[PDB]
Design a binder for this molecule. Structure first.
Ligand code: KEP
Length: 277
């Protein structure tokens, strides 16, 4: 079985990044023991097993040019994927401003929309769409690189109701996710709009969605922060345009209060393609 990786041949090189419960490391799968084997990205849980198994099964069945490739498993379980040395958009964009212009940013935007549209056609909701979860294949190509919070939508139903909201990226969340823990495909569209703002600002820390929303609502509300966030959104207030009128209009359509007034990923692709011709 080419999808079964033996523990004794999986050699750790360095850490790549980590979340609260999971981590990704650069390993070499070296059965010949001479450091000639291929380099792979390995996702493991820190010393949630049920959630990782579900996550592995989802990725095993996704095949798209803008989705990170599943390679296999190491059985306790570890997820084995292809290694992208340029890393996440969050770390790549600040170091490569001179290489990446607005035209390339809009191509990245189309690519994220295509990968997301494919996911949504398989009845899944991502729930964690941000620049930190987008990998750089090359200066011409990006891939959605993580599915840690991904959930299947019930048949003859349009949303998944979340029970555990403890590690939620609240500054990327739509009003319905904040008020009722209801995740629709339209909720993923809202998060894309915030990811697009990150992309246009080159993932600058001082201009991050969290930095900007805290300046809008005040940073001393503590436990009332999410309530204040809900209030500002209810008023019609949104993240400002980075220091491109037509791109900002597609972004504002991602941020329509009611999920029904929001566009679809297919509609956004048409929008970006019209601007690239
Ligand atoms: C700083 N950082 C870098 C990361 N990853 C890579 O560099 C990487 C390269 N190839 N590869 C293949 C699959 C998954 N990750 C990678 C992460 C990272 C960490 C976690 Cl816990 C989950 C997803 C992550 O990656 C994100 F982008 F999807 N943080």
């Amino acid at each position: 079985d080419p999808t079964h990786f033996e523990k004794r041949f999986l050699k750790r090189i360095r850490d790549l990044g980590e979340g609260h419960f999971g981590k990704v490391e650069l390993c070499r799968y070296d059965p010949e023991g001479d450091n000639t084997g291929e380099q792979v990205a390995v996702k493991s849980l820190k010393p949630h097993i049920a959630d990782l198994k579900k996550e592995i099964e989802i990725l095993r069945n996704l095949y798209h040019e803008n989705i990170v490739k599943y390679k296999g498993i190491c059985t306790g379980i570890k997820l084995i994927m292809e290694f992208l040395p340029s890393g996440s958009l969050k770390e790549y964009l600040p170091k490569n401003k001179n290489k990446i212009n607005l035209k390339q940013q809009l191509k990245y935007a189309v690519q994220i929309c295509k990968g997301m549209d494919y996911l949504g056609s398989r009845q899944y909701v991502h729930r964690d769409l941000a620049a930190r979860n987008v990998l750089v294949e090359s200066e011409h190509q990006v891939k959605i690189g993580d599915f840690g919070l991904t959930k299947a939508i019930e048949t003859d139903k349009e949303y998944y109701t979340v029970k555990d909201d403890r590690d939620s990226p609240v500054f990327w969340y739509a009003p319905e996710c904040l008020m009722q823990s209801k995740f629709y495909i339209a909720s993923d569209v809202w998060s894309f709009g915030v990811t697009l703002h990150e992309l246009l600002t080159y993932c600058d820390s001082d201009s991050s969605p969290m930095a900007l929303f805290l300046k809008m609502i005040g940073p001393t509300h503590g436990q009332m922060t999410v309530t204040r966030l809900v209030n500002t959104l209810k008023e019609g207030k949104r993240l400002p345009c980075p220091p491109p009128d037509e791109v900002y209009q597609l972004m504002r359509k991602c941020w329509e209060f009611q999920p029904s007034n929001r566009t679809s990923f297919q509609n956004l692709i048409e929008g970006f393609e019209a601007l690239l011709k």
